[PDB]
Amino acid sequence: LYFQGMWDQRLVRLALLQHLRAFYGIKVGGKIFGVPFNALPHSAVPEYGHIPSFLVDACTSLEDHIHTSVIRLKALKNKVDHGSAPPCDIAGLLKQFFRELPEPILPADLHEALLKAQQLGTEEKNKATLLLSCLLADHTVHVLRYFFNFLRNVSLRSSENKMDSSNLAVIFAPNLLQTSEGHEKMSSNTEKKLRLQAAVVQTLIDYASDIGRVPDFILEKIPAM
């Protein structure tokens, strides 16, 4: 995201926040699991930068199965936490990984904003949501661009695996946002929130390649370095 690097990020940030209010009214013990993801072993990944090695290796292992017991899952988690798997279990570990992060990778302060974005009209949800992703720390931006690319790829092959972006979002959203799951006795309010939280994640999947990417109408308002 070189082109946007030609602007003082400080100002880019101010301008994003200004547009979000003006235009939309949105005002803002082991080795792997539970560790802040920035503190984990990273691997240089091309066109994405440095991404945590667990993520890279989990996703890369599932690459070949995109078409496709918590006792057995837990054993693998422990082996991984201590330092080939069935694909099911890798997937299972990816969900647990995000759930167990000290802080949610989509930070809590953005959640309301993200949900608000998801009440806008179709065309404008997408825009707002993507503007919100540009508020993310750029390490996060790169980890998320990588992961959402992986997700997107699963989704694009749904004729086969049956997991479209809606289907994936429902599953991952609670793990990414670190929220509760759907249940039977849900209030009308609790459930609407769930759906919209999944909708956030679904948008992120569908527009994976545009995550963290500042639009020209933002940049246009500012002079560059």
Curated annotation (Swiss-Prot):
Domain Rho-GAP: 35-212
UniProt superkingdom: Eukaryota
Location of this chain's protein in the cell: Nucleus
Function statement: GTPase activator for the Rho-type GTPases by converting them to an inactive GDP-bound state.
Name listed for the protein in its UniProt record: Rho GTPase-activating protein 11A
Gene coding for it: ARHGAP11A
Location of this fragment in the whole protein: 1 to 252 of 1023
